[PDB]
Amino acid sequence: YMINDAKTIQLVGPLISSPDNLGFQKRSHKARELPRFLINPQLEKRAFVQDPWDKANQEKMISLEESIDDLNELYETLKKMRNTERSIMEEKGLVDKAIVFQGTCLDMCPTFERSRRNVEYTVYSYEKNQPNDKKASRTKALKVFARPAAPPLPSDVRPPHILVKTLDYIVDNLLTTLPESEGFLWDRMRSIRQDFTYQNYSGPEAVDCNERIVRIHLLILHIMVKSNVEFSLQQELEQLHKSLITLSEIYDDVRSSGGTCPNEAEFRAYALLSKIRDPQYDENIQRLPKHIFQDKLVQMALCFRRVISNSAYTERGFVKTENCLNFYARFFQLMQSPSLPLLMGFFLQMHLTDIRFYALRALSHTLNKKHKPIPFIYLENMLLFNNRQEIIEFCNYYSIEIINGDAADLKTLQHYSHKLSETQPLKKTYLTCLERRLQKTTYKGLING
Amino acid sequence: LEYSDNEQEIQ
Amino acid sequence: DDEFEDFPINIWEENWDDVDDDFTNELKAELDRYKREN
Amino acid sequence: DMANQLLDELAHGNFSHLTLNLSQNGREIAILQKQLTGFDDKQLETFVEQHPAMPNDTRFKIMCTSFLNYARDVDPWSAWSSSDLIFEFYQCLINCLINDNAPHIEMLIPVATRETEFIINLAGKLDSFHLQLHTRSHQFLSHISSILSRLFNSIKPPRGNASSTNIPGKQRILLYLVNKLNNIYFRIESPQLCSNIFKNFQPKSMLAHFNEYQLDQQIEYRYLLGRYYLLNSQVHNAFVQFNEAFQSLLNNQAITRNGTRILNYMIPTGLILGKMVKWGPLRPFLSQETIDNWSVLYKHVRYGNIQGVSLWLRQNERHLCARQLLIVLLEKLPMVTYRNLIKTVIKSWTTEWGQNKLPYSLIERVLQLSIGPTFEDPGAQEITIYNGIHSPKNVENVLVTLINLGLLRANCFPQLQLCVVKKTTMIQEIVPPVNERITKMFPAHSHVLW
């Protein structure tokens, strides 16, 4: 029903100033149903609530996991139990066949899922007490990202405080397993964010979990590139971008309700780097309050967007804009600043090849035809290449002729775009100074901020 | 060592 | 506010490349001083 | 029996009393409310359904019933309590225009525009109380935009071999609807939703020259199109619309205020493209402090003062941010400023003193004066957008971009640490005019839309 009160009605005001002059009389109107377009995620902490049968049923599943030693027998036992569970949960109105869905899985991985992954042998070594264990450990297994059709049961979804507990376990125990565990961590972190969406929950746990997951993604980006371990850069950046979009949406809703999030400026700055050339993020950042816009992290990110901007940036579907700086020299100076946050630098390492290409492309246009090849030592210092092998490989990728193994003939650069048509992209790289900074701190300290 | 125009490359 | 209100029914300097400025004066002061020292 | 009398008018295309503005029909609504009291919702529907000469149209009968429901239950002492009746009727009214052959559609067109203006104002006021009404931000205005968007989708041009020149009401209000929709998207802080509206405007138009629309609707469309372009950092695209909108306006105090609104965007947009206004003809639209403010920035840009441009933007940061001007000015103004600073150097160094070779150390000394403090320097130990971008050390980078933008005809010799320009006295051969160079490299979409 619609909101009728005294305070709200007085505040909003009347339709006309003096209705009684026109012939109206005050009538006590009946309460009318709320119209379809005024229907309204949760932004405040809610006390955990669990149905007594759901609690009892889950405890039986744990007991049966301890008692039944046969893997397939335990799984089939929980399968028929789950079929009973769904109808009962449907009858209680706690799952659809709108309902405010509340997760009640108190483990890091649902008990039913643990038994299922035992049968499919999709349990990781990180999820077992001992490597040769036939069973996934209840205290070590992490729920995978759900890839189904029926709605997840309350016993399938972890509540917000358990989700925080799971991320705490990842931060405390699993960061040092990178780069080997990147597939595991990426999937498990995706599931943690999925559980929040299942409950439509945007409270402090969702903010805290999304923030630290974004930080883990930025750490992963540098670790995989430095270790030269093959991974999907695209999948890591997609989830990292999606978590940043989620954080921005929660930051917006919290602001509309009159609250604040202490770490908003840091992750507004990260979001400014997810799509470095998209004018959308320049527009959105200008709408934010002064204390967010003027925060040093946001200012630092805005500087990087300015220096990276290039009027010659060539890519299908990208619209070139006027008077761009193409300040590659400033970019590498800022990259080396001790005041640059490490995780922020890890994000900006994604554009090293792009910035380097258009620096060489722009410089070559200023050279007359008789100009001698540019010595590598000049280009290495100007583009902050790690070693001589990196600049040699760079010139080979872009078909830039190398003279005497130590100079680049920039007039031989024929490409006008950093992206080649029938070739895989250049192997991603990193900056030595950022790697050295990583070795002077801990993974856990970086993620916890 | 003199100015050589490269407007074709620039444009 | 930036929204238009209801109303049913040259501007540009042709050549600013062709005046005293304090910044300009200091600039050629540096330009001349560089010339003597080199 | 006023209810029977009202239904007789509506059934015959007479919509004199069909409005939500009680300032226009409050007396009739008050009489209607008293007479309709006691009849339940079913009986009100029966009154419409059984009425003689009532068009056999489901949506038209739904519209009439929702007005009767509005009249019966409206509370003039509470806009919020009556809002559900008001918004429900408005949706029903707009649904009566979706079918191009709906009954009395031509007579309904003036009513729909009139009620749209009423509901837009009311939805804005209700949105400002979003916290108290427990509604998300812009929920009321976004709902209106949803309704107006569906009406926009239903507008189609007649056949290419139409039998008559008639302009239906939906075509007559096409640009009016476009401007109303795009204005809402800007208000609810989602101006990129205009993209669909802009793209599908001309295909829906039966007029084959954009200038055939009303001039006031032409000017507002160009104003919003320019702002949309500027939000995408497409400066020249925005300028052409801003410049054409203002010149058409020059050919009410609301018109004067509207001219000011264009100028707030046209002036910075033209400055980025190396164009400066004449302050004389702009006096009726701009207050003297506004003229003085931009003139200071004009001074910094014209004579190549990087630090002045940065400090000017810092002073104006808040109101530039409110118009989404800070970022585009911070990014694309320096290269114009750099060009002018370099032009003055070449004028003395090359065209006067005959030296066609410019040592990088000379440029660094020049850049040190122009830029001043940087993030690394003592006294500024925290990075800002005003001290973190420009550094006098990056002499070659500044020259390279100037050459690559076509603003400087020069060659770079990184090993010799010098810059070579053409041997001449004509400065325009070395530093061509800015606006021509930029617009040649970045041609804009034509001012003639079609």
Side-chain angles (χ1 to χ4, degrees), chain A residues 113-168:
Chain A
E113 175 168 323
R114 291 200 295 276
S115 77
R116 197 209 28 186
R117 302 212 265 112
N118 296 336
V119 158
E120 323 177 328
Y121 305 92
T122 53
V123 177
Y124 280 81
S125 77
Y126 316 114
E127 311 182 296
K128 307 203 197 210
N129 307 304
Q130 331 301 359
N132 315 117
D133 285 26
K134 267 268 268 207
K135 266 179 182 171
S137 170
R138 173 225 189 150
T139 54
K140 294 192 88 198
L142 264 42
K143 175 186 188 185
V144 304
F145 174 75
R147 316 157 145 224
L153 294 174
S155 59
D156 296 326
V157 174
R158 301 153 286 186
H161 70 283
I162 295 313
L163 289 167
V164 170
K165 203 169 137 24
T166 307
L167 199 54
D168 286 343

Side-chain angles (χ1 to χ4, degrees), chain A residues 3 13 15 30 32 37 256 280 283 294 299 306 321-323 325-326 328-330 333 339 362 366 378, chain D residues 73 76 79-81 84 137 139 192 236 272 317 326 331-332 375-376 385 388 394 396-397 401 404 412:
Chain A
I3 299 101
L15 282 171
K30 86 294 193 184
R32 285 191 303 277
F37 79 97
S256 269
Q280 185 51 68
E283 161 193 323
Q294 297 194 341
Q299 297 275 304
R306 278 354 107 194
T321 69
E322 300 85 342
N323 303 357
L325 297 176
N326 197 31
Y328 48 86
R330 190 66 193 155
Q333 292 161 1
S339 62
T366 80
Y378 185 80
Chain D
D73 304 330
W80 162 239
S81 308
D84 67 310
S137 269
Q139 183 157 10
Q192 302 307 317
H236 191 198
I272 290 153
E317 177 186 293
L326 195 274
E331 179 178 281
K332 316 183 171 291
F375 166 53
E376 45 246 25
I385 61 179
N394 314 328
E396 193 163 85
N397 203 161
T401 298
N404 276 260
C412 282

Side-chain angles (χ1 to χ4, degrees), chain A residues 152-357:
Chain A
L153 294 174
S155 59
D156 296 326
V157 174
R158 301 153 286 186
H161 70 283
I162 295 313
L163 289 167
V164 170
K165 203 169 137 24
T166 307
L167 199 54
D168 286 343
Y169 171 87
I170 288 172
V171 169
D172 290 336
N173 298 111
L174 292 178
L175 299 181
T176 55
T177 57
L178 291 163
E180 286 87 1
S181 57
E182 180 259 353
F184 176 65
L185 288 196
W186 179 86
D187 178 89
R188 293 324 185 266
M189 274 174 327
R190 201 184 178 188
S191 162
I192 285 170
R193 295 168 39 233
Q194 189 180 46
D195 276 6
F196 281 113
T197 304
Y198 279 145
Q199 296 162 102
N200 208 244
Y201 185 83
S202 294
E205 297 99 320
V207 178
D208 169 57
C209 279
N210 271 278
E211 281 176 350
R212 300 197 279 147
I213 284 164
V214 152
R215 291 199 191 123
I216 292 169
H217 280 304
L218 301 170
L219 178 59
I220 285 177
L221 289 176
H222 174 92
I223 290 180
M224 313 295 288
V225 173
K226 166 72 186 57
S227 67
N228 203 200
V229 168
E230 286 335 272
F231 80 114
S232 179
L233 185 71
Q234 174 210 180
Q235 289 214 279
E236 281 286 353
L237 297 155
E238 265 146 26
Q239 289 323 300
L240 158 62
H241 180 71
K242 263 154 206 325
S243 185
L244 284 171
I245 296 313
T246 281
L247 275 170
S248 298
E249 276 161 27
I250 306 181
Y251 294 149
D252 289 346
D253 291 358
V254 163
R255 173 160 297 110
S256 269
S257 305
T260 42
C261 304
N263 299 305
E264 179 182 354
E266 170 187 4
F267 294 85
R268 296 290 193 187
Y270 294 150
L272 284 170
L273 313 172
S274 196
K275 306 226 287 144
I276 209 89
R277 303 173 198 281
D278 194 333
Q280 185 51 68
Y281 296 81
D282 292 325
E283 161 193 323
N284 288 165
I285 198 71
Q286 283 170 97
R287 308 177 178 283
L288 297 186
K290 198 167 93 133
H291 67 95
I292 299 301
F293 186 87
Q294 297 194 341
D295 189 282
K296 46 160 117 166
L297 312 163
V298 165
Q299 297 275 304
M300 171 90 85
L302 283 176
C303 287
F304 277 106
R305 281 176 74 89
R306 278 354 107 194
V307 303
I308 293 176
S309 81
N310 188 359
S311 288
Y313 182 83
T314 306
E315 182 178 9
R316 227 184 86 246
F318 180 82
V319 171
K320 264 159 232 178
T321 69
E322 300 85 342
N323 303 357
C324 287
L325 297 176
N326 197 31
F327 272 9
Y328 48 86
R330 190 66 193 155
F331 166 84
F332 287 111
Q333 292 161 1
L334 288 176
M335 272 318 225
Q336 288 169 120
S337 175
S339 62
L340 169 79
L342 194 42
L343 297 175
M344 175 158 327
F346 290 166
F347 216 168
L348 293 147
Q349 285 185 144
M350 289 310 117
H351 297 91
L352 281 172
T353 294
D354 306 67
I355 289 145
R356 279 167 180 159
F357 168 87

Side-chain angles (χ1 to χ4, degrees), chain A residues 323, chain C residues 12 16, chain D residues 230 235-236 238-240 242-243 262-277 294 298 301 329 333 336 434-435 438-439:
Chain A
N323 303 357
Chain C
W12 308 96
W16 57 277
Chain D
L230 187 59
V235 172
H236 191 198
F239 174 82
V240 168
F242 284 140
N243 184 58
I262 302 171
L263 293 184
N264 290 339
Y265 290 100
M266 191 178 74
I267 286 170
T269 305
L271 187 61
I272 290 153
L273 307 177
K275 294 198 85 167
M276 278 147 114
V277 309
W294 288 108
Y298 272 16
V301 169
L329 281 180
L333 265 196
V336 183
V434 156
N435 185 247
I438 301 184
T439 54

Side-chain angles (χ1 to χ4, degrees), chain D residues 247-266:
Chain D
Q247 302 248 19
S248 303
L249 185 133
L250 277 148
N251 310 353
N252 278 103
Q253 270 313 278
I255 307 183
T256 290
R257 280 187 300 273
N258 284 350
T260 312
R261 285 166 180 114
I262 302 171
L263 293 184
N264 290 339
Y265 290 100
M266 191 178 74

